[PDB]
Structure 1
């Protein structure tokens, strides 16, 4: 509807796949080459479904900060026959607050879904499902089951992936450029 939705759509149409694990269907952001991200609670194993195709997982790493605190991001390398458009230049270098973000989701249940979530706070610490978690972004939108893995963008930046909510607020794990240096 506006330039925020334009940037979000451009990311969704080229840099997402539908990922299915034993724990459900997730929006999955492809970052570069065969490297993608998903919330760590997806519990990626040795085999994942990507757009309903059985795919070997070549590597999966659940990220933690240097305090050994959960970040809720898993970086997955997929045995896929095709590379993602490289979007690393759209990743922030530092922890930050944002104005006017969009949360975008694409699954079997919620195709072509875009949500203007408004102001994004650098919230920091969250007890997420009982797990101490750092680098959390917060938005005042009542997000629901089925939006985990959704991409959070502003114009020109891909800033996080949705990992939870409390009924009134939604929470995303930060994406930082330093997670994807090769």
Structure 2
């Protein structure tokens, strides 16, 4: 509809795949080369399905901060015959708050879905499904099961991936440039 949705659509059409684990179907953001991200609660194993194709996982790392606190981001290197467009230059360098964000989801359940979530707060600490979690972003949108892994963008920045909600608010894990140097 406008320049928020334009940037969101470019990221979705080139830099997302559908990932399936034993824990469900997720939006998965490709960042550069064969490196992608997914919520840690997807429980990535040795094999994952990518767009319904059996794919070996070359490496997987569940990120934690230097206090040994969950960040809810798993970085995955996929045994795929093609690289992602490099979008590292759209990642923020620091923790921040944002205006006018879009949450974009692409799965079998929610194809080509874009949600204007509005203002995004640096919320910080969240007890997410019982697990203490840091670097959480919050938006005041009533997000639903099936949105996990959804990409949060502003015009020109890829800022986070959706990891949960409480029925009134949605929560994303921050993406930072330093995760992918």
Please confirm whether the aligned pair reaches a TM-score higher than 0.5, indicating the same fold.
Answer: yes
Q: Distance in 1 between matches of 2:144 and 2:71?
A: 20
**TM-score, length of structure 1 as denominator length:** 0.99
Residue 63 (structure 1) shift: 0.1
Name structure 2 gaps, 5 residues minimum: none
Residue 59 (structure 1) shift: 0.2
Secondary structure of 2:54 counterpart = strand
Secondary structure of 1:7 counterpart = helix
Residue 131 (structure 1) shift: 0.2
RMSD: 0.2
Q: Distance in 1 between matches of 2:65 and 2:119?
A: 25
Secondary structure of 1:27 counterpart = strand
After superposition, give the CA deviation of every residue in 1:55-114 in whole Å (9 maximum; x if it has no partner): 000000000000000000000000000000000000000000000000000000000000
Runs of 4+ in 1 over 3 A off after TM superposition: none
Residue 53 (structure 1) shift: 0.3
Secondary structure of 2:12 counterpart = helix
Secondary structure of 1:68 counterpart = coil
Name structure 1 gaps, 5 residues minimum: none
**TM-score, length of structure 2 as denominator length:** 1.00
Q: Distance in 1 between matches of 2:126 and 2:24?
A: 23
Q: Distance in 1 between matches of 2:39 and 2:73?
A: 5
After superposition, give the CA deviation of every residue in 1:26-79 in whole Å (9 maximum; x if it has no partner): 000000000000000000000000000000000000000000000000000000
Q: Distance in 1 between matches of 2:25 and 2:129?
A: 19
Query: Residue 176 of structure 2 corresponds to which residue in structure 1?
Result: 176
